[PDB]
Amino acid sequence: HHWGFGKHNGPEHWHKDFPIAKGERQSPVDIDTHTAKYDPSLKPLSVSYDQATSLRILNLGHAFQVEFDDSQDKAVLKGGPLDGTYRLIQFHFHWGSHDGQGSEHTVDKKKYAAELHLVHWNTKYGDFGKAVQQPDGLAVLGIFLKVGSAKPGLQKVVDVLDSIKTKGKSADFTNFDPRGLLPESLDYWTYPGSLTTPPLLECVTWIVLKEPISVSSEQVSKFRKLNFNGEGEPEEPMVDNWRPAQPLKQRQIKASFK
Numbered sequence: 001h002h003w004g005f006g007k008h009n010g011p012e013h014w015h016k017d018f019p020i021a022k023g024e025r026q027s028p029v030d031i032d033t034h035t036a037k038y039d040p041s042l043k044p045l046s047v048s049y050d051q052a053t054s055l056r057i058l059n060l061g062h063a064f065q066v067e068f069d070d071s072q073d074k075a076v077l078k079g080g081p082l083d084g085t086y087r088l089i090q091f092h093f094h095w096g097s098h099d100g101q102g103s104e105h106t107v108d109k110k111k112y113a114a115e116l117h118l119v120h121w122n123t124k125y126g127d128f129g130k131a132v133q134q135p136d137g138l139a140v141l142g143i144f145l146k147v148g149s150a151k152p153g154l155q156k157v158v159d160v161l162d163s164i165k166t167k168g169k170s171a172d173f174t175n176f177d178p179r180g181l182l183p184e185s186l187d188y189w190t191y192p193g194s195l196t197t198p199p200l201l202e203c204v205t206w207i208v209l210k211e212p213i214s215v216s217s218e219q220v221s222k223f224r225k226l227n228f229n230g231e232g233e234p235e236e237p238m239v240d241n242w243r244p245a246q247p248l249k250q251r252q253i254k255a256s257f258k
């Protein structure tokens, strides 16, 4: 009964193995735009992906992840609410069983068709594993996906997914430029929170972009053809791998805009 997104092992059950699931700094959250606070002191984000080096793409079971060479010192997220520099290690998505749900963060309760997380670790701490043990260990850039026109910079991802249908499969995924996954504007909300899969560690500065990227119905539908199961096991399509919004509790969501 490893955690996952079935009826028996899904988000409602995670607290039994990971009691921090009911903790004080859990993610995702609903972003209530009336109660979020515009902070004029929040500076622009700095996302430098020019020299990011993608390596491989893996079906981990609950989702797929594209991994990067985080020995590169130039593929970095910094600025914004951050007081350090953070190296890109991987990205992945969350999505639904239909276009009407799939995002983890919500905006005034609005759910998007999917959400992209670009995960970066703090260069103060040596590596990812050591970083997640610190309250400022990770900076995750979250980006909503809505269905409309196609996102060209996502196509290489969409095209490869048929090769990694079942858990444990992977593919070469070199020369992928994650700049192609960013919207035009980098206006953002930000708050302190957690990983949204177990172990749910409270080590993340969340930066959630106001502007969603547009992806086509065809592109997001490919996500739903992935499987949670391993090869030869009964087919279980990989859908609804999003943790729902958790209580904000003490925290203050801040915005770079009104």
Ligand SMILES: [Zn+2]
Residues within 6 Å of the ligand: 092, 093, 094, 117, 196
């Ligand atoms: Zn995520």
